[PDB]
Amino acid sequence: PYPNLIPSANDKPYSSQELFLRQLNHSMRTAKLGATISKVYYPHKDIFYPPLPENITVESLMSAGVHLGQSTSLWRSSTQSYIYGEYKGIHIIDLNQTLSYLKRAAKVVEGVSESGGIILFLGTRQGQKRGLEEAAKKTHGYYVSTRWIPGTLTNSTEISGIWEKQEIDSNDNPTERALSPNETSKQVKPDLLVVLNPTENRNALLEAIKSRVPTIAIIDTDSEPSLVTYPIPGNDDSLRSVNFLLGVLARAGQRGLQNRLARNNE
């Protein structure tokens, strides 16, 4: 439990570490006494307990702030059909269209994960690393959050060719087989690319277009809907909305992975 700890003698008072363990024991048992908190938003849960696509309501999407679009002065008129209206100097996104597009994109992610494809979560804004990493880990996928190197797809040999690759079974179990140099030097291309900030990742979208990689993205009021295969109308500048949508997609991918493993284990 807590090795390399030297308890104190009964005559002497508690030590700092003994006090820490005493307070930990208190916290895990009695600190939570008196009431149970209900109907309160805790940000971390948005990453760790995302809802299923079918359980999402318009109220839940509005609570996450998905509806809040860009300023009316920065409007991209090609996004007219996704807009419910304008309010307080900003455009409001139609959350029913958002719900439909999000369910469709979640089905796409679930199908791709169930087929064993490679899913890449690209988001390069400040505090998006946590959700991206968790989505990649629970979908058995991959993620980028520092910077998208241009040419990562169209120039894969000169960018990603040096990093190591791995053969795996139907159950995602390492086989530890030795790969030939030609096999190691092939391009490994994502089967699905999801972008949280498509406005700042035009290079990735264009590379996916050139390389025929279907792509999902959160299309804000100032973003181009036609640059992506499966747009999701929603707010991309709020971390809560981005994490909510990303958690939904990641849970869909996890469900697909679980279905794949269940079928392989029967």
Partner 1 sequence: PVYRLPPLPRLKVKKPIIRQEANKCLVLMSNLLQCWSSYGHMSPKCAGLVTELKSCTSESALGKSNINYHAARLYDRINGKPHD
Partner 2 sequence: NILPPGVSLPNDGGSKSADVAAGLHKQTGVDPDYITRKLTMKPLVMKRVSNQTGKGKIASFYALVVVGDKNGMVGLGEGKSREEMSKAIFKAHWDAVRNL
Partner 3 sequence: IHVVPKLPNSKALLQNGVPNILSSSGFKTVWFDYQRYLCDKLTLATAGQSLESYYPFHILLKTAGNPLQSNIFNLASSIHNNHLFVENILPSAKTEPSRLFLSKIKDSFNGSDWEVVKEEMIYRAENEVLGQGWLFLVENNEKKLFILTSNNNGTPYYFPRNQSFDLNSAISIDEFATLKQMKELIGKSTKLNGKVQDWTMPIICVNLWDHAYLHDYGVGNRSKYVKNVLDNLNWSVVNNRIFS
For binding to partner 3 (CB under 8 A), which residues are involved? 10, 13-14, 19, 21-23, 25-26, 29-40, 42
Nearest to 67 by CA among 240, 198, 225: 240
With CB under 8 A as the contact rule, the residue among 185, 258, 263, 264 that binds partner 2 is 185
Return the range that interacts with partner 2 (CB under 8 A); candidates 15-23, 25-33, 181-189, 244-252.
181-189
Nearer to partner 2, 156 or 238 (CB): 156
Return the range that interacts with Mg ion (CB under 5 A); candidates 46-54, 99-107, 214-222, 252-260.
214-222
Nearer to partner 1, 81 or 171 (CB): 81
Burial of 215 (0-12, 13-18, 19+ CB in 10 A): buried
Please report whether residue 52 would count as binding partner 1 according to CB under 8 A.
no
Please report whether residue 164 would count as binding partner 2 according to CB under 8 A.
no
Nearest to 145 by CA among 135, 157, 158: 135
The one of partner 1, Mg ion, partner 2, none whose footprint includes residue 74, by CB under 5 to 8 A per kind, is: partner 1
Residues 209-228 within binding reach of partner 1 (CB under 8 A): 222
Please report whether residue 236 would count as binding Mg ion according to CB under 5 A.
yes
Q: Which is it for strands 119-122 and 192-195: parallel, antiparallel or unpaired?
A: parallel
Please report whether residue 74 would count as binding partner 1 according to CB under 8 A.
yes
Angle at 195 between CA 172 and CA 226, to 5 degrees: 125
d(CA 234, CA 78): 15
Q: What are residue 4's phi and psi, to 5 degrees?
A: 50, 30
With CB under 8 A as the contact rule, the residue among 186, 258, 263, 264 that binds partner 2 is 186
Please report whether residue 10 would count as binding partner 2 according to CB under 8 A.
no
Nearest approach, Cβ of 206 to partner 1 (angstroms)? 13
With CB under 8 A as the contact rule, the residue among 18, 65, 72, 76 that binds partner 1 is 76
Strand partners, 215: 193
What DSSP designation does 146 have? S
The one of partner 1, Mg ion, partner 2, none whose footprint includes residue 166, by CB under 5 to 8 A per kind, is: none
DSSP string for 76-129 = -GGGGGGEEEEETTEEEE-HHHHHHHHHHHHHHHHHHHHTT--EEEE--STT-H
Residues 124-153 within binding reach of partner 1 (CB under 8 A): none
The one of partner 1, Mg ion, partner 3, none whose footprint includes residue 220, by CB under 5 to 8 A per kind, is: Mg ion
End-to-end C-alpha distance for the chain, whole angstroms: 38
Nearest approach, Cβ of 76 to partner 1 (angstroms)? 5
Record the tokens describing residue 82, joined without a space. 């996704």
Burial of 217 (0-12, 13-18, 19+ CB in 10 A): buried
Please report whether residue 114 would count as binding partner 1 according to CB under 8 A.
no
Residues that bind partner 2 (CB under 8 A): 156-157, 181-182, 185-187, 189, 211
